[PDB]
Structures are given as C-alpha cells and as structure tokens.
C-alpha cells in the first residue's frame, strides 16, 4: 500500500502530466514528457504502451 495517500505535496500537470508527492522532486520538476501512448492503471501501476490491450484490461476490471 504505502500509507494514507491523498493530494498533499503532489502537483499533477495538465500538459506534461508529471506527478510528484516528493517535495524534492517538485524542486527538480522538469516539464517535458514525450507521452505518445502510455496508460497507467491505479492498482496495476505498470504502464501499458497500447490502448487496445488496455480496453481488454478494463474488461478484466468489469464485474458480471
Ligand atoms: Zn510538469
Ligand atoms: Zn488494471
């Protein structure tokens, strides 16, 4: 898990989409992200480089 997580210290950019809860990483925050096709899943934090398998992966999160 990690602990009691919520929007505290974290800046989430709209354009570069970089997100850091670590205050040191906001001081080192460098806006410039080549974000072609990458989708992070909340629980399965490993990023998917494809949209189609991601859609089938959401079907895996869908109940009956
Ligand atoms: Zn940024
Ligand atoms: Zn997932």
Swiss-Prot record:
Zinc finger (C2H2-type) residue numbers: 11-31, 39-61
Domain of life: Eukaryota
Tissues expressing the protein: Expressed in pancreatic duct cells. Expressed in several tumor cell lines of neuroendocrine origin including pheochromocytoma, medullary thyroid carcinoma, insulinoma, medulloblastoma, retinoblastoma, pheochromacytoma, medullary thyroid carcinoma and small cell lung carcinoma.
Spans through the membrane: none
Induction section of the entry: Up-regulated by transcription factors, such as MASH1, NEUROD1, NEUROG3, NGN3 and TCF3.
Subcellular location: Nucleus
Domain comment as written in the entry: The C-terminal region is necessary for NEUROD1 promoter DNA-binding and transcriptional repressor activity.
Family, per entry: Belongs to the INSM1 family.
Subunit structure: Interacts (via the SNAG domain) with HDAC1. Interacts (via the SNAG domain) with HDAC2. Interacts (via the SNAG domain) with KDM1A. Interacts (via the SNAG domain) with RCOR1. Interacts with SORBS1. Interacts (via the N-terminal region) with CCND1 (via cyclin N-terminal domain); the interaction competes with the binding of CCND1 to CDK4 during cell cycle progression and increases its transcriptional repressor activity. Interacts with HDAC3; the interaction increases its transcriptional repressor activity.
Role description: Sequence-specific DNA-binding transcriptional regulator that plays a key role in neurogenesis and neuroendocrine cell differentiation during embryonic and/or fetal development. Binds to the consensus sequence 5'-[TG][TC][TC][TT][GA]GGG[CG]A-3' in target promoters. Acts as a transcriptional repressor of NEUROD1 and INS expression via its interaction with cyclin CCND1 in a cell cycle-independent manner. Negatively regulates skeletal muscle-specific gene expression in endocrine cells of the pituitary by inhibiting the Notch signaling pathway.
Name by which UniProt lists this protein: Insulinoma-associated protein 1
